[PDB]
Design a protein around this nucleic acid. Structure first.
Lengths: 126, 49, 79, 136, 59
RNA sequence: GUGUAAGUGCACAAGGGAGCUUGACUGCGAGACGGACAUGUCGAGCAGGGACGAAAGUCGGGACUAGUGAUCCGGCACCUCU
RNA sequence: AUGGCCGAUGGGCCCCACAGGGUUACUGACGUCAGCCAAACUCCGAAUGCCGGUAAGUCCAAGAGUGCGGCAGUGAGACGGCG
RNA sequence: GUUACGGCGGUCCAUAGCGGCAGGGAAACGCCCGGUCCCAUCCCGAACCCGGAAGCUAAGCCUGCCAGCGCCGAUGAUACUACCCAUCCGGGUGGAAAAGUAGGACACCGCCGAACAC
């Protein structure tokens, strides 16, 4: 038989990411007038939601899954800027200009920072 | 003489005042610390001995 | 003989000043406390002495959130 | 004489002599036992004298248990002194014995000698008490 | 549904709640009888001053 | 473990570490606590000019509660007062 | 803090070195079974009381309550019930 | 709309956990491959970050099985208890009513998205 003994780095990463997500989410929370732009970031893809934590409901979502962004001949940062553009314009459609950025317990840089800067360009305020 | 004395941090560019406390056994007299004065804005303050 | 005791501090009048349902103004002291036996929640803030004050009008609502006992201020809807 | 190795508080309020005992109401250790019917502070001296009385009325053979430890201090001001000037220093060590509480237990073959030994102990004790049995 | 409540004992030695409950029932003297309903309010008042009153279910 | 007594709290960390820093600010303060009086305490929020932070936001000393002394009198600095 | 159980630990003994071993008349921690205690212990937790709201009651009165002001006196309490 | 599903949240944050023993890899979550680039380690490309898609569900994650450990847990009774009666009975009345125990309780709810369906 087999029995691994230590929790894998995947478990460590997941639990730690959730810890520091909750850490910043102590201060950050979303509303209908200032939604929480919450990020999830895998090594393959990136996802964002706009949340109103009052009711725990999502207003607009975007991701590097759909073909319109998956078809880019570029890096994950290129996919990220496209996702930021998409969630910006979808939020504008939903009646949003101002949000608060939840980086999902990740480090603000690279892909996440590019997404955020792209949404800032496209019109969202943060 | 006390270790933690009054200090009386005064300002450069106008010698007006802010006061707080700082231990004497730090190897200096010079607590250069920024502060907002009346009649000007944020500038460096030092301790007149 | 003699006693080495005899001292005591001043009573600090800690406690809960505005209980559940009590309508309060903003800034009203709800809870005088040393730590966070009562935690701050909706429209409630924590002072330097761990005192709980309303950030908005409403009726005090005592609740729980992840085991912590919380103090919340629910709005009073005007007619 | 029984006594604790230490107490966190040497000077304590008098234990409340009220209520029927909620624990130690039964035997759980032996065959025959002493049950109390009054409230009282039972002391080191009382406990040791009663234990000794049992151990003398009957000898090698059987076993004895003491289901109470006197860990509750009782102070005494000096004599020929005025009231005040602080609380007294610990003099006595007692156990607050509510009714129902089983104090002494033993296992011995003959019910006669066992009951008689327990009677000796009760006469050493300051309270009205009772013989009880593991069976009922 | 209706209760005749007759004060039989005095307020002397009686506590504030009891005295004011008697007042709230409308009683001010021994052998003063007042007629009330069997509601919860007067039931609670009677529970507070049962020792001071004699109660009779009308009809 | 929390600088230090104890308690209340803190693992969501208020505990441990690093970077940058001086808000250990100025003018103010809705409203409250406590309340013989005098004392004392919390305080969102507005502005100024700042620190940190990508931003939200936080910062008017310290996890909290002790670490202090009324008034008179006089001293020092500054002030478009007399 | 009571008794059991286990048995580290040491003390001895024997193999007798010095280590490593078994073995114990003994101590016997830790852990565990059962029964217990605490004003400065609490996984718990009342009743009452307290705060607030609300509906009523009393309501030709409690001669209430609050605010202001004039005038006070009191600021040595006692016993009893309960804690 | 359906998923052995990916996120974001909620609950008097344990009926939710832990530990099972049998399973899954569609997209996704993941480990995983490498450090050229932003970035990074008080040392370490372990982590953080970036670029990637070789193989693997082994683990995390997820699904089913549970009273094994913990958690919840009535009722009734008892204790305690406000008021009352009672010339010591701390006796008793009518109200409130635990803890412990026992019987029994094994995750749920919402929003979005993904694949499919459509």
């Amino acid at each position: 038989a087999h029995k691994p003994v230590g929790q894998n780095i995947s478990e460590v990463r997941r639990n730690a990411r959730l810890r520091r997500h909750a850490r910043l989410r102590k201060k950050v929370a979303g509303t209908a007038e200032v939604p929480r732009l919450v990020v999830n970031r895998s090594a393959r893809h990136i996802h964002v939601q706009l949340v109103n934590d009052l009711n725990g409901t999502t207003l607009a979502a975007a991701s590097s899954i759909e073909a319109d962004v998956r078809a880019i001949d570029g890096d994950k940062k290129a996919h990220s800027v496209r996702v930021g553009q998409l969630i910006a314009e979808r939020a504008k459609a939903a009646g949003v200009e101002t949000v608060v950025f939840d980086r999902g317990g990740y480090t603000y840089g690279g892909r996440i920072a590019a997404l955020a800067d792209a949404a800032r360009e496209a019109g969202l305020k943060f | 003489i006390r270790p933690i004395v009054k200090l009386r941090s005064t300002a450069g560019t106008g010698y007006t005042y802010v006061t707080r406390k700082n231990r004497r056994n730090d190897p200096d007299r010079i607590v250069l610390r920024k502060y907002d004065p009346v009649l000007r804005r944020h500038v460096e303050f030092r301790e007149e001995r | 003989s003699s006693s080495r005791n005899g001292r005591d501090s001043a009573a600090q009048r800690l406690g809960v000043k505005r209980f559940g349902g009590q309508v309060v103004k903003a800034g009203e002291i709800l809870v005088r406390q040393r730590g966070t036996h009562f935690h701050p929640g909706v429209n409630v803030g924590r002072g330097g002495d761990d005192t709980l004050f309303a950030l908005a009008p409403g009726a005090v609502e005592f609740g729980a959130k992840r085991g912590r006992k919380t103090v919340n201020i629910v709005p009073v809807a005007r007619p | 004489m029984l006594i604790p190795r230490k107490v966190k508080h040497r000077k304590q309020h008098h234990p409340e002599q009220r209520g029927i005992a909620s624990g130690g109401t039964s035997v759980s250790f032996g065959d025959y036992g002493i049950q109390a019917l009054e409230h009282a502070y039972i002391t080191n001296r009382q406990i040791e004298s009663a234990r000794i009385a049992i151990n003398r009325h009957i000898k090698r053979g059987g076993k004895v248990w003491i289901n109470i430890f006197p860990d509750r201090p009782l102070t005494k001001k000096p004599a020929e002194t005025r009231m005040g000037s602080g609380k007294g220093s610990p003099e006595w060590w007692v156990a607050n014995v509510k009714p129902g509480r089983v104090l002494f237990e033993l296992s011995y073959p003959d019910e006669k000698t066992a009951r008689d030994a327990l009677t000796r102990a009760i006469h050493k004790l300051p309270i009205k008490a009772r013989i009880v049995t593991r069976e009922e | 549904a209706e209760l005749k409540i007759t004060q039989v004992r005095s307020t002397i030695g009686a506590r504030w709640k009891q005295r004011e409950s008697l007042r709230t029932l409308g009683l001010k003297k021994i052998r003063q009888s007042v007629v009330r309903e069997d509601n919860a309010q007067t039931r609670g008042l009677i529970n507070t001053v049962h020792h001071l009153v004699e109660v009779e279910e009308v009809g």
